[PDB]
């Protein structure tokens, strides 16, 4: 529910920790935090997906893309994936 939405949002959040860690900006307790979040969302995704029909199931990967989009919208940024898609103004 609010559980699905919250999972997808948290999957975007995870993707951002990951991107930041890739750029060597995430500190060591931050990377512990990233590992806890990934394990926790994995277990939460397994459970949520097990309680829905086949066609209402989504991998972590798909969900990350959903949460990244949510994050863009909330921060008032163009919602399109990737570096392509900006408007001029």
In terms of Cα–Cα distance, which of 59, 78, 76 is closest to 15?
59
61 binds, among a second copy, Br ion, none (CB under 5 to 8 A by kind): Br ion
Q: In this chain, which of 22, 87, 88, 89 binds Br ion, going by CB under 5 A?
A: 87
Q: How many Å apart are CA 41 and CA 6, to the nearest integer?
A: 10
Residue of 5, 47, 52, 73 that binds Br ion (CB under 5 A): 5
**In angstroms, what is the minimal distance from the CB of 35 to a second copy?**
9
Specify the DSSP class assigned to residue 76: T
**Site residues for Br ion per CB under 5 A:** 1, 5, 8, 15, 21, 27-28, 31, 33, 57, 59-61, 64-65, 68, 77-83, 87
């Amino acid at each position: 529910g609010a559980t699905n939405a919250t999972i997808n949002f948290e999957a975007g959040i995870l993707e951002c920790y990951e991107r930041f860690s890739w750029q060597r900006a995430l500190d060591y307790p931050g990377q512990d935090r990233l590992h806890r979040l990934k394990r926790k969302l994995e277990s939460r995704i397994k459970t949520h997906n097990k309680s829905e029909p086949e066609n209402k199931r989504m991998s972590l990967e798909e969900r990350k893309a959903i949460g990244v989009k949510m994050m863009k919208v909330l921060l008032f940024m163009d919602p399109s994936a990737g570096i392509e898609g900006f408007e001029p103004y």
